[PDB]
Amino acid sequence: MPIDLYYVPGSAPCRNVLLAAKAVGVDLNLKLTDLKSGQHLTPEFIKLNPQHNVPTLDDNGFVLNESRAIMTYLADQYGKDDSLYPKDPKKRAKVNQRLYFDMGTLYQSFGDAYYPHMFGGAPLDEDKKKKLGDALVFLDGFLEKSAFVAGEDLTLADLAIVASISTIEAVEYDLSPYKNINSWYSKVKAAAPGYKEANEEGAKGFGQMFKAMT
Amino acid sequence: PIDLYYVPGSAPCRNVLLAAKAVGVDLNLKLTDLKSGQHLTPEFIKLNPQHNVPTLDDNGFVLNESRAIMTYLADQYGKDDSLYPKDPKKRAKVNQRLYFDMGTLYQSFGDAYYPHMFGGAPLDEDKKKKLGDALVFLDGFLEKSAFVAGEDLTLADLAIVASISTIEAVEYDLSPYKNINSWYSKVKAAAPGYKEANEEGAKGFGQMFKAMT
Numbered sequence: 001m002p003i004d005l006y007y008v009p010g011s012a013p014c015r016n017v018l019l020a021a022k023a024v025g026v027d028l029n030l031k032l033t034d035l036k037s038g039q040h041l042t043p044e045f046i047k048l049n050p051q052h053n054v055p056t057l058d059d060n061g062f063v064l065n066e067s068r069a070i071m072t073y074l075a076d077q078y079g080k081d082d083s084l085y086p087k088d089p090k091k092r093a094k095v096n097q098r099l100y101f102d103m104g105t106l107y108q109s110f111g112d113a114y115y116p117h118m119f120g121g122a123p124l125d126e127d128k129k130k131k132l133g134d135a136l137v138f139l140d141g142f143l144e145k146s147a148f149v150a151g152e153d154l155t156l157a158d159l160a161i162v163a164s165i166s167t168i169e170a171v172e173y174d175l176s177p178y179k180n181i182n183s184w185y186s187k188v189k190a191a192a193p194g195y196k197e198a199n200e201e202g203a204k205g206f207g208q209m210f211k212a213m214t
Numbered sequence: 215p216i217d218l219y220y221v222p223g224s225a226p227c228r229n230v231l232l233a234a235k236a237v238g239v240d241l242n243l244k245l246t247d248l249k250s251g252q253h254l255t256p257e258f259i260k261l262n263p264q265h266n267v268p269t270l271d272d273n274g275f276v277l278n279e280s281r282a283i284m285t286y287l288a289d290q291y292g293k294d295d296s297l298y299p300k301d302p303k304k305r306a307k308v309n310q311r312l313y314f315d316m317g318t319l320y321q322s323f324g325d326a327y328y329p330h331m332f333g334g335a336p337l338d339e340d341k342k343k344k345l346g347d348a349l350v351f352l353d354g355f356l357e358k359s360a361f362v363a364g365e366d367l368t369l370a371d372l373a374i375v376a377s378i379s380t381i382e383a384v385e386y387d388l389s390p391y392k393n394i395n396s397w398y399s400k401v402k403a404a405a406p407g408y409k410e411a412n413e414e415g416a417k418g419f420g421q422m423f424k425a426m427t
């Protein structure tokens with residue numbers, strides 16, 4: 001059977017996976033799982049994934065959540081060669097490093113600053129914004145030294161980080177200080193297969209939803 | 215030589231010290247005093263611009279992010295496939311649990327305790343509750359598997375045991391979680407070098423907590 005992906009388009013973690021699947025060359029059967037209306041909280045979804053979250057991959061009964069685990073699973077299980085996620089232990093470690101940066105530092109700080117404001121009606125906190133800036137400073141630093149985030153080729157880590165950066169852009173955060181981010185971002189938009197469909201449109205939709213909600 | 219810049223009370227540092235024991239990698243430990251800015255010297259920053267620990271320096275190859283260092287030691291020096299299986303599906307279960315550990319378990323612990331320990335803030339019982347939720351999910355994982363990602367000790371058990379030992383050290387109450395507690399016993403015994411790598415640092419962290427608290 002085709003591999004199912006339970007997802008919503010505006011979700012950056014979901015876009016991580018959409019991008020990885022396009023880059024690897026995997027067709028997914030997309031199962032829209034609307035969170036507003038609780039589709040992740042049905043009895044059948046809970047049974048599939050006790051954490052009741054998207055993305056959830058179901059590859060013919062093999063089920064994963066965690067976007068970044070899903071990305072590397074697709075790449076190793078279905079990739080034609082290892083360019084997007086090298087077998088070499090050192091190059092692979094660099095990609096993993098930046099995937100953890102993306103989760104724990106970049107995307108975490110974005111969510112910390114923006115989700116309570118968007119979903120909880122909380123004031124946008126300047127201290128929290130600052131910490132998202134600090135994360136952007138680091139990423140700009142990475143990209144000063146290398147063409148892509150984990151080295152000289154586009155890898156899974158650029159795909160996750162672009163999903164996060166496009167989301168940060170979509171809430172109208174000012175990316176103008178980060179010249180290396182900006183140059184890289186243009187490069188990834190052109191290089192990442194299926195960029196516009198897998199990421200750009202969902203990110204733009206997130207931005208619309210942010211405006212509406214705030 | 216393979217250097218580790220660290221402090222022992224840090225759960226992310228213990229993540230690595232555990233992995234290093236399990237894989238069988240000797241590390242030259244370089245204690246890094248954070249309170250006096252040793253991670254902020256020019257030399258450090260040159261090595262790791264994020265100025266954080268753990269930092270690994272494997273003969274000039276530099277990494278930060280504990281969980282990436284863990285899987286690097288296995289990938290580069292590993293002799294036991296069962297610790298971090300090469301099979302893509304088994305490996306993905308290990309990876310899934312590592313991301314659970316950073317993004318759900320340890321995240322929710324840090325959100326609940328760090329503001330209090332490091333910010334003077336009072337403990338928010340709703341944030342503690344979200345840590346509870348993460349522990350509920352973990353306890354569930356362990357209902358139908360011996361270890362967090364399958365039937366063998368893996369790198370994911372080692373990260374999660376660093377996290378749970380930290381959670382225990384702040385006197386959070388783990389008695390409701392029967393599967394976590396059974397698993398925790400097993401890992402303390404199964405993980406090579408567990409006391410050296412993890413116990414004293416978790417105890418240290420707990421003392422620090424009690425002092426700052």
Ligand SMILES: N[C@@H](CCC(=O)N[C@@H](CS)C(=O)NCC(=O)O)C(=O)O
Nearest residue numbers: 011013052053054055066067068317
């Ligand atoms: N760390 C996870 C995050 C997944 C996540 O945050 N999903 C959100 C949507 S963006 C969700 O499904 N929330 C519903 C829930 O957890 O109840 C990943 O990378 O996949």
Ligand SMILES: N[C@@H](CCC(=O)N[C@@H](CS)C(=O)NCC(=O)O)C(=O)O
Nearest residue numbers: 104224226265266267268279280281
């Ligand atoms: N996600 C990183 C977190 C590392 C981390 O937060 N280290 C702390 C100690 S527990 C630190 O070095 N803080 C100093 C700083 O960030 O400037 C990992 O897993 O290694």
